Amino acid sequence: SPLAAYEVDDSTGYLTSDVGGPIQDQTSLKAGIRGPTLLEDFMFRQKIQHFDHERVPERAVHARGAGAHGTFTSYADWSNITAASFLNATGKQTPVFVRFSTVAGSRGSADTARDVHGFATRFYTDEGNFDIVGNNIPVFFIQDAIQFPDLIHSVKPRPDNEIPQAATAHDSAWDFFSQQPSTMHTLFWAMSGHGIPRSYRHMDGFGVHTFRFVKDDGSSKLIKWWFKSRQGKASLVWEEAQVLSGKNADFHRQDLWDAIESGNGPEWDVCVQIVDESQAQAFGFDLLDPTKIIPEEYAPLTKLGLLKLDRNPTNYFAETEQVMFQPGHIVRGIDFTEDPLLQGRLFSYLDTQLNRNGGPNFEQLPINMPRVPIHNNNRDGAGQMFIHRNKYPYTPNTLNSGYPRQANQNAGRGFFTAPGRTASGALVREVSPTFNDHWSQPRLFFNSLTPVEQQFLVNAMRFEISLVKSEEVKKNVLTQLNRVSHDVAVRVAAAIGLGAPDADDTYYHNNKTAGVSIVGSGPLPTIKTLRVGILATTSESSALDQAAQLRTRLEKDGLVVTVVAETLREGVDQTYSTADATGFDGVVVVDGAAALFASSPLFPTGRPLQIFVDAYRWGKPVGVCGGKSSEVLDAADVPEDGDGVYSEESVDMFVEEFEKGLATFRFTDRFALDS
Amino acid sequence: SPLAAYEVDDSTGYLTSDVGGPIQDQTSLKAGIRGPTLLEDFMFRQKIQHFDHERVPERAVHARGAGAHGTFTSYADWSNITAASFLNATGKQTPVFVRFSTVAGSRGSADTARDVHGFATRFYTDEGNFDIVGNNIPVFFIQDAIQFPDLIHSVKPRPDNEIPQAATAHDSAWDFFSQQPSTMHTLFWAMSGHGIPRSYRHMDGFGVHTFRFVKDDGSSKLIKWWFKSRQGKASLVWEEAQVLSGKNADFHRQDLWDAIESGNGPEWDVCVQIVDESQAQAFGFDLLDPTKIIPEEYAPLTKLGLLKLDRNPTNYFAETEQVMFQPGHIVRGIDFTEDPLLQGRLFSYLDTQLNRNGGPNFEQLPINMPRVPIHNNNRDGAGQMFIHRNKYPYTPNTLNSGYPRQANQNAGRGFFTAPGRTASGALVREVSPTFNDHWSQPRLFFNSLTPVEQQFLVNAMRFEISLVKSEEVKKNVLTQLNRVSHDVAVRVAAAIGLGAPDADDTYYHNNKTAGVSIVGSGPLPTIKTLRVGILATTSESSALDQAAQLRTRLEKDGLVVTVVAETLREGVDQTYSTADATGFDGVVVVDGAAALFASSPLFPTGRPLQIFVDAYRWGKPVGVCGGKSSEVLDAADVPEDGDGVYSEESVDMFVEEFEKGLATFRFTDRFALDS
Amino acid sequence: SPLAAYEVDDSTGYLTSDVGGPIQDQTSLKAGIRGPTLLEDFMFRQKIQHFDHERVPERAVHARGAGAHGTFTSYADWSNITAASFLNATGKQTPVFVRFSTVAGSRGSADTARDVHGFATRFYTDEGNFDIVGNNIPVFFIQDAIQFPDLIHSVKPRPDNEIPQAATAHDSAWDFFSQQPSTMHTLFWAMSGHGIPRSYRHMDGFGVHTFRFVKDDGSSKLIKWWFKSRQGKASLVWEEAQVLSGKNADFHRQDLWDAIESGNGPEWDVCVQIVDESQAQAFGFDLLDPTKIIPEEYAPLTKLGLLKLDRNPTNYFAETEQVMFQPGHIVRGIDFTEDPLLQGRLFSYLDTQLNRNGGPNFEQLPINMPRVPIHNNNRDGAGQMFIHRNKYPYTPNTLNSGYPRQANQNAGRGFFTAPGRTASGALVREVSPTFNDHWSQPRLFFNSLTPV
Ligand code: HDD
Ligand code: HDD
Ligand code: HDD
Ligand SMILES: [Ca+2]
Ligand SMILES: [Ca+2]
Ligand SMILES: [Ca+2]
Ligand SMILES: [Ca+2]
Ligand SMILES: [Ca+2]
Ligand SMILES: [Ca+2]
Ligand SMILES: [Ca+2]
């Protein structure tokens, strides 16, 4: 509806060419009924040419992703810290579009690959489009934009055979990580549950770089952007993520689409850490360094407003595929910093859209257009959609009365560089020595996780590094891990049959910071949209009655309920053939269905039991409803007294207990820990 | 209208980026006042990226041209001969756009090169866009589309050095013409005054190919399209065209622009010759052969309606440069024929727009859009400007209720191939023997010109062939010319110092046809827009008074008057420095200015007399107004008794006589003839 | 030819497709002798598709031009002023390609329009391609690259009707000149005989900007490039130029082509004015200001070597139309200055080749290739002609033994920024007041012409 002016309705009418001539498109024109096709068949050629040219280049990174429309609402008048118009009044609303993504995979790769995730937000402001092009991880692998192709070549598939897809689990990636120690912090985040989020809705977004807020008086402060999820944080477990990559490559885009259509559109508090210019080097690291966080203990979050996604696209290609974000899409009241990663990005995003669009007029695509007037002397180029009336498109002119007028700090609400910014020194291709500590913050992050989270991170590294063929690369990796934590290096080395190097305690410490643990972020604040699989049977009418009564009680609380049975019928959503534990956040067996848990042509041997066992092993709340639990729980080897295992006769009591389980989300006592 | 919706007004406001952010664009952002430019200067890069990408590939042919908007009005309900909707009612109006062009020159080449000229007309009909992509000459050089690159490579500049621009006067072109005798008919037209028309408004347009008109009952007739100029026919002389190419490379586009702005928008009667399907081979040649005309004596013209151009474009690049014509843009009621030149064109024009536009969505540019709804399953591609609501874009479907519906002869006013068409025989790459007479019609054309026109054509061939370096090519040329006319070959040979081959009378005859002669087409039906230069002086108050009284009386009759003098002042439009005889259709000297016709720092020596003499030598009406007369005519060696030479004291009597001269347009008795 | 390995010979043999299948190309395949053309006629479609796509975008400026190959020969070992390898020995020869042009006209406009002219030279050095992208007039219209589209829009045809072609003789151009007084110096040069040279061979070339020569020890000097014509200087007269624009739009390209074929290949002494860094503001104007010349009386020319053009192209499109010059094509021993016109050009020329070539691999076109090995981790892109053996194209790596190695001042003959260059002050979009005298040098130029 924000792009309603560009919509084309095909719910009625006769087929036409692109120039409005009514045609057919089902049979080629031929010289006789069993004859050759004619070149004069323009109906054929226009249709096939279009098809032949449908594809455009995938994004060079973040190729796999999905988007939605929404609204940003300001919680206050923020004039006292920024001139930005979209933040200048309590309750002020601005349309947004957001795209979420992975980084490394090509555009049909699985959502649930282990990776960094993008979170890109466009504010269609009344003073121009403003984009925050962020990730779900607050720090980046590298300290200089010029290194980006080195990073990306190393993590993408090996270029002789293009193996492996959407994965860091190969020699080249771990070679790069071990030789470029800046990578350690982002690596630790990606090897945590932050690399396999439960959904786009259950992850945060970060600007990563320090930016500036600039007031109308010219004064500036340093900021970091934080989008805090109102759905809570949650992750998958790796073994789950692997199966889900096969059973549902579209899991995250489906989850987002469904949440929006059910009226559960996801929300984030859009926040900033704000510090003075004088604190650039006050926190024991450089705020120009994008491998570093500011701990919340040193600078608290200020909540600026609400981001809500509540409308799905009409056409994916036209909206999601074509949206072209840029950190260069900046508005008055915001400015850059001398972060050498940010500085280079400003070049890349303007240039890459030429590749994607094939032409320079990509800002004229509906999804990229602003919602205010455009007044400039840009002309021509392939795909030019405007018809410009001003026939004197040069400045300075008298023949168009000196219009358009120049905008700056003092006239026309122009963008302006923060006027206190300076530069001083030699022109150098040198790294600031203030960037040289690559290991303390990785250690801060590791220290801040729970014991089971630390085990999962260790396990993710053991998984990936065990697939590295080069013994030299594996040694080099242990050398770098060892500088973060001797314990990590020892535990990782045990899996790959190497000795860890001797402890090097230069960067070891015991500091912790709040807000980076997933397990530690307590029960989820809402269980709406979570998925409950009810395993039933058509062989017992009482099993379907149990299923229907459970459905009513669970749906009342906004859970998405799937009843599973051997075959479809009224009340049954899915067959055992298509069902999997990866499709549910909790699994309930109705006790009328106990007999399935001891063969059928309608689903693979042991499928009903496998769903239950997989769900248990992956830490999910599981239960049996009806009061006869022993047969199912014994077949599964699930103890009745287990945490997150439910056994009740009463449907009401069953659901009350089970819903607490869904909020807990994962029962971490079911995972073994290294001594 | 898609044009009005995309018009952009920059007559007020502050400069913005393409995403609506107010900016400046006059100074680069630098590290200090004498420092280097910063990469983070997004204002710089967006502006320069746009400039860097302004150009698109020129058209492969017809790159040099100009366009205007107007209206077509039907004179009648033509249902009795065609189903075409734009012809289905008396007074029915359809918007048009027309582009006129040369063929061989690049953008930037001179309008007044000797060449075939394009005349491409788009009708934005209520049943889709219909294009007639025609030339100002009714026959084409070649008989099969597959030869087009051979023709075009031969006429375009030699590919080692890219010489010469916009000219057939070089060895490769005449090699091709002499080896491919199909070229003779079009060659004769191009070597006549049809190769150097006075304006786009003073030339006719032709579809060239035989097409079909198809009725709603399925019956068909064969047609040729003829656009007959209501301004009359007129040419330049070669020596004038050469000078004009240097003095004003924009002469034809200026003439069109100016006529439209003064409310003298040019008009054509849109006509057809209509013959029965059974007459395809009845006239002594094949109607599938595009090297042949139907003589008016064999099939008279039917006037279908009025084409008027009356509005200039707003932005040349957006409208004229981007307009993308196709013979494949056809409507119900029209069909193709098996002309092997037409057949191949249908492929070329769909394909080449991919080159020009850089992507498949070229029909979405405003100038290319239709004026009725588009309903089809074409999707995606670079530059996709629509948001399609139908999410089941396939046929057959139930999930969008079977829409869009198929259109055909019986439903939806679908296009349909003429149902009487058949094909029979071997699949062959062979030329029909009915196409083999390459010489009789060239001779018919030559016979139909006046003696002086025949001399001009011989003179154009003497000029071009004299510049061919190869003696063998020159001999081969005489061989082919000789098959058309022994006299032509004798007269051409005299200039290049070869002997003509012996007469070969196989194709010789004395038949003539009406309507192909320019000299023969009688006085112009209107003199509005024609240019009168009045040569005066600032020395003499009486010269300027003579000039002003002449101006008033000439401007009354719609003539564009320029008073020329040594310097500008009130009443004087142009200096002798910038004035040339090529800028006028008639030249008047006022008596008071006699002294200039016997040196000055304000213009080149002899410029005033040169303008007068050049005008006389090129056949234009010339005179002296004031009744001294003898001194100026003696200085010029212009005889007072000469046809188109005027000498009067009375301004009223002078103008009455002079205006008849302008209608006569050219005085051909001033050109020498071969014995 | 220097480009002999890429040449295709068609002086014998049978017509083939682009994939070597022998074919014909004179008649379409039809359903009967008077029948419609068949879609299965691949001979037709491959031929016509190629034709349909022959054209590329003309250059945004300098679209009308012509080129030739030649040789540059150094007169000495210039190590005392520059590390540049092509200048490091007496008699050292380097292949060149040069393109000359007008500025404003489209690619079939007249050579003898009144205009500034381009003079672009590529040296295919043994340390990489070095381009000097110069003009025949030593000063430019504007003082900041960001103004270039304003200048060019004003001088190009009015955008409602695209009139007039290749001429400053219209309201918009003179509006710009009169409102932007920086333009006065170049305007006076264009309005002199330098706007209508007799030939490309009878004009000089200038780098325009101050550049730096950098020695292997890191010290730098400021230079201006001057290519002095050994044929002399000569102009047309305007009335002559106008007539010639119609009688022979190809006059300058024909003149060059003919001179080369007759064994009269044109020559230039390649010269520099060399001054110390301390003289940037010593001559009464700023050397960062591209609207200013250094009078020969203040800094004399040093002759570095001979440029001779002596071989015409084989294929105009492939060589002349496709050559893609960049001031960013720099070699060790040369460096930029903070001239805000030069600074912006560095961005433009890399970007615009994407428009012309339609793809990122434009340096692989034969005319653009270097004459020395390429070792880098650039990969893929449309039109990729190389087959790279190194399957670890990232730095730092161990799996390709740390190759390619980094090159810099101290290893691998790397390019390096002149190490004494600094910046200091506010980040500003402000013009230096040292650039404000727009009128004295125009007057110096006018004073220096003869009465006629
Ligand atoms: C020097 C190059 C470079 C560097 C250092 C980065 N990126 Fe980037 N990024 C690109 C070059 C790039 C790109 C090649 O320009 C992409 C590809 C597609 C596009 O429009 O831009 C891109 C895409 C891209 C997307 C996808 C936007 C969308 O959904 O369409 C996200 C979310 C980011 N990037 C985020 C980041 C973050 C958070 C970074 C570091 C803090 C980062 N990028 C550094
Ligand atoms: C098989 C190729 C071929 C053949 C045989 C022809 N043409 Fe064509 N023509 C082209 C291939 C083409 C082209 C390459 O497709 C052009 C260049 C730009 C475009 O839109 O199509 C074109 C452009 C073009 C234009 C310019 C349209 C404009 O103003 O934009 C006109 C007026 C014609 N042609 C007319 C003719 C006529 C009357 C022909 C024979 C009767 C003819 N052409 C044969
Ligand atoms: C910021 C933009 C800009 C600015 C300030 C300039 N130019 Fe430029 N120039 C271009 C943008 C450009 C371009 C758009 O990037 C072109 C078009 C084609 C190409 O390869 O580069 C170009 C082409 C071009 C050519 C044609 C090279 C060839 O023959 O292919 C010459 C000789 C010059 N320029 C010379 C200059 C000189 C002597 C300048 C000032 C001292 C100058 N340009 C400033
Ligand atoms: Ca690998
Ligand atoms: Ca976790
Ligand atoms: Ca392209
Ligand atoms: Ca030739
Ligand atoms: Ca049909
Ligand atoms: Ca103008
Ligand atoms: Ca002179």
Author numbering:
A (entry chain D), B (entry chain A): 21 to 618, 622 to 698
C (entry chain C): 21 to 472
Can you provide the manuscript's text about this entry?
Catalases (hydrogen-peroxide:hydrogen-peroxide oxido­reductases; EC 1.11.1.6) are redox enzymes that are responsible for the dismutation of hydrogen peroxide into water and molecular oxygen. The structures reveal a homotetrameric enzyme in which each of the four active sites consists of a pentacoordinated iron protoporphyrin IX prosthetic group with a tyrosin­ate axial ligand. The heme is deeply buried inside the protein, with a complex network of channels providing access to the exterior. We have previously shown that in addition to catalase activity, the catalase from S. thermophilum (CATPO) possesses a promiscuous phenolic oxidase activity in the absence of hydrogen peroxide.
We therefore generated a series of site-directed mutants around the putative 3TR/catechol binding pocket to further test this hypothesis. The residues Pro158, His246, Gln293, Ile313, Ile314, Glu316, Leu321 and Val536 surround the 3TR binding pocket and are structurally homologous to the residues that bind NADPH in the mammalian catalases. Specifically, the variants P158W, H246W, Q293W, I313F, I314F, E316F, E316H, L321A, V536A and V536W were constructed. The catechol oxidase activities of the H246W, I314F, L321A and V536W variants were noticeably reduced (50–92%) with respect to the wild-type enzyme, whereas the E316F, E316H, I313F and V536A variants of CATPO had little effect on the oxidase activity. A similar picture is seen for His246, which lies directly below and perpendicular to the 3TR ring in the CATPO–3TR complex.
